[PDB]
Symmetry: D3
């Protein structure tokens, strides 16, 4: 294995454990939670920092928006030695109890996107690794953060989530959205389906937690809908979960 084309990393540049935010600008924020983390690469939408946690090498690499760029990151990180991943992002609540400021931990994801379909037949479930999921749930409890563990909807079109009525395929998006609501779906985001399915194929462990920035369903009902933007809580949960996974390994 040599220099990776998209991420510009080589074997030895990253740890076995990696946190993956969508926004490259969030990597520095996350790296602050690691020990002696330095920037290893900044290529395209991929910023990578590597430091340590409990003395073990760990990294944080952005994926950009969408399963296409996210799967490229997992593939190249895996080739360089990574085997445990935790996506840390933002999401829009669906379930009425999921409010801005809360944390969502994905147990699985709705594969309404194309990247996963180029990895596995659609019938295969996008499911998060059990160990990573439990580590996240336990971390949130220990830190005292309100959390929701459940399925999250993934999609390829961000504007299909907030303006489905305008789309040529509005009927499809609207019908499926009601379906997600009737299935107990917690929130909506964009990268977990691709990461979970790719992880199943690559044989690595992957989980995800998110900061709920708001809830459109609560808004439509006129219910109080506080907005949030600071991902610190979600980051703290992911880092504590990593410490747990590292020690258990």
């Amino acid at each position: 294995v040599g220099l990776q084309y998209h991420l510009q990393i080589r074997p030895g540049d990253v740890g076995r454990y990696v946190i993956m935010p969508g926004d490259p600008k969030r990597c520095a924020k996350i790296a602050e939670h690691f020990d002696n983390a330095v920037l290893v690469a900044d290529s395209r939408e991929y910023v990578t920092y590597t430091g340590t946690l409990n003395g073990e090498k760990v990294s944080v690499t952005s994926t950009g928006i969408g399963g296409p760029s996210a799967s490229i990151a997992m593939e190249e990180l895996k080739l360089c030695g990574a085997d445990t991943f935790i996506r840390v992002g933002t999401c829009g609540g669906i379930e009425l109890d999921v409010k801005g400021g809360d944390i969502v931990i994905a147990t699985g994801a709705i594969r309404m996107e194309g990247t996963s379909k180029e990895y596995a037949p659609i019938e295969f479930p996008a499911v998060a690794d059990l160990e990573v999921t439990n580590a996240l749930v336990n971390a949130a409890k220990k830190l005292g953060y309100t959390s929701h563990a459940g399925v999250v909807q993934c999609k390829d079109a961000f504007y299909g989530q907030h303006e489905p009525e305008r789309m040529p395929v509005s009927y499809e998006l609207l019908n499926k959205w009601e379906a997600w609501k009737r299935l107990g779906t917690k929130a909506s985001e964009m990268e977990s389906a691709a990461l979970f399915v790719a992880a199943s194929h690559l044989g690595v462990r992957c989980g995800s937690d998110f900061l709920v920035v708001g809830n459109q369903e609560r808004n439509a009902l006129g219910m109080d809908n506080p907005m949030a933007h600071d991902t610190e809580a979600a980051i703290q949960v992911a880092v504590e979960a990593l410490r747990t996974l590292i020690e258990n390994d």
Copy 2:
């Protein structure tokens, strides 16, 4: 709510916790693990016994083979007050490490069947309830049984699994089978996809464990292929998991 057409049960007949084997003949065997279990109903392929565990009312109801009959059981049990379900069945191993005699615990299921598609869009994941899954995993470790926690393939055609080459759609079955193998799938069975998706819709908790009867992949490679038919171990794991869920209620 009154008398259920298919199961012939009514509110009060069953507990909130129900174990669900596929074979009606297995209900009596499972009922022996409960305290003072009595036969409640014997309608069609649905045999139901209700007793107590740790003083809480519990039941066991057969689903028959297939998502169609299994979904009916969950629907009617739910209408009568059931809200926590654990399927206990048999399966065929895929992953080479999954041998006859071992126990498999489904974290999710491949929706290669039609029942779940009449409940949810195919993109939705058939995922087991986190609490039930952890209860099963812990029970298996406590009892010292070799277990495998992962995704199981569900299907509608049993003979499509064992005689794919002869089917008109052999090409599709064989292609998908290789796909399941490359996705770390643990074993193959038939009811979890329907039960998991139906559960997501109904708002109830559902999990599954199975006795591995054999492994066709090991057989195809000329490897050891011990056969097993006694589901006592899978049943013990399910009963202990139920006890845990009852305690943590």
Copy 3:
């Protein structure tokens, strides 16, 4: 899996246990009732949801084996019966009327089935029609006429989710179920049941003859319009039609 040559894993039958002609109800409890129509029938196997009785009709060996609810269990029955020598099958069940002329008490004979289920898709590409054998269908139609029972020969809708038929509005995929239901109504569909699609398609692949008749238990569409909707539960009439059809097929095969 069965540990013995010829022993069928699920049905627990062996070559010699069943005749070439088999009636297939969904409910295992209905087998005894059907067996009474044969001469000297005896139970040969009772495994899982599969109860099998064998006797004779006009001196020819015949059987009745339950399939349980759904294409998954029904396909297993046909596969294992076929391996034991069966080659002519007639499903006898219950169905819910769709066409407004299909009333409770009437008999429906399936000429084909709507493949809105997954079992048939694991046998054949969805484009292939789930169509009943011509000889069996004609035998059923002629038997109902001879016996004087009002019948309707046409397409039946098959499905995997019973509760999707009666509670579609509640389903996450309600939009799909409701839209397709309107399509079935506009295509002259007679009634709704669950096993014929799987049985007809498997039969086409296995090279055996299969047909189906059903007792109409009611009609939801007539009920929705406020039209008289008499309910029914006794499958005796449907059974009589099936047994008479078997007599016809047995004699014609000679």
Copy 4:
């Protein structure tokens, strides 16, 4: 109802019973089997002759190749009063027993085409009317022609049937072809799926019989593969079937 745009026919121009060949040039041939048939219209690929059989008004209208043109014919004939249709065409054998010269009677059809999908969800079976099918089977028996009653494969791409290996989607066509063989499919043609499904929606009776022109599967195995082109036999069976259907309606 007035003048139909594509067929250029109006109520009264056609009978309740119509035979439908694919080739417009085959209409004159079929018309000879009726009594005092006259040319009614010649529009696009649609030629229509109307005459009588047993004193009842009957017609023959070509459909052209494919479900798109055939469905237009059924829709417009239906609007003008037609309610019983029998397609008479040619087909290529699949089943090894189906040889050139033989007649095939479609009990149903494989919907591997797009026209039917714009009428009904793909799960709906393309199934021929019981009465018409029995009439055809009884006619073939009475006339003494070797016939095969079973499912036929329909398709939209003729060259996908004969040159599948060359197609970009060769893998799909070849795989499905093997599936049709393993399902007992009798032969391959192109219009029945569209006509059967449309008939189910329109509430009319439709059936089909064909002249087997050859069998590629027999040719692939080096078996004797007689070639045929005279649709006379298939036509005689369809006309005899129309005759008994007419008598039964009386």
Copy 5:
């Protein structure tokens, strides 16, 4: 390569450039635009005329209605040496600016039909050849005809376009129709999707222009809806485009 089964043509009978109308009766009208056109064949719904344009051999062959019959025509013409095709038909407008009498030039087509799916995976775009499309656009401008260059919707069920509400799959047809409207679709017809995709596989150039016969969407909104039937303009544009292509190919 010998006699083609369906079109009844053989190498040498047609030029490299072919105009393809849907109606066999329109071939004679189009042939008048060529120099010294001769009737080469009249088989089934396929009428073929061959003459010259600027001294170069060119032909006109009807396709009948639908992708199935049109694909057969392209396949057989191609085997006989044709490599540049221009479909000339009629269409119903969708885009509110597309009025009866106007000319529509297809830059691509919506594959809501089955023929193309037997040639290519549905994801592949039905796109017209750039050179042919530019020749058509420039020709329309030169001749002074109002034209619209864009995507056209293809379908297999003509009656699904005008009577969607009645169809068993009305919900699907209606939803998709609204989608086509929100994607700037110019008009609706039936053969371009099949021809464009088949052309991509066969390695030939294909384009299409149509006479707008009316606009149902304008009518639905109560807007002036002038209707037309004379394809003379659409034919002139295609013939002028052929002259351009012929000269540029030199």
Copy 6:
């Protein structure tokens, strides 16, 4: 009214009606050098935006990142801010054997083997490039003297599905479809045009695309000379020249 865009962090007035869109945010500065007095407008997430002028007209360059999901977001937000003419400038892997490293590919349409476009339009709708933009690109390539190939390009969501399909659980599907693309005259493989073309059809804007061929796996499989390329200057020059004539034609 339209305000600050969440993802791109731009507002009405920040960008011109004409925008060039590379996939790599790092390629924006290089493209901007082709404009007059370009200045950085925003740098948010994978979206870097520069705005300057070309022949007096305001023009911009904004990166899309990899994939239709990020690309569609860029088009949506740029459109809201007033952009109506887009030209993607990227890199691609050749398929047709005549498409080799260094050449320029101009997409006339795209294979929708990705999910973003499906959340915009039914799959039957063609992903087709705007006629004016495509012609402008073709004319520019000829004028500048660069070898170019105008045709259909394959779009996908999984980069590693293109380069190691044999490994994938769905290898059978990827491999079969790849042969189909080869038999349909497909020129090259990339990732964002399908989403951009379809979104443009819906939004009512003009979109085209040109790419630098960086390699050709099919040529390599046959042992043919397979030179690698990475300098996008040529593809950029063609896009800028196309923008220039499009601007002139609109005036």
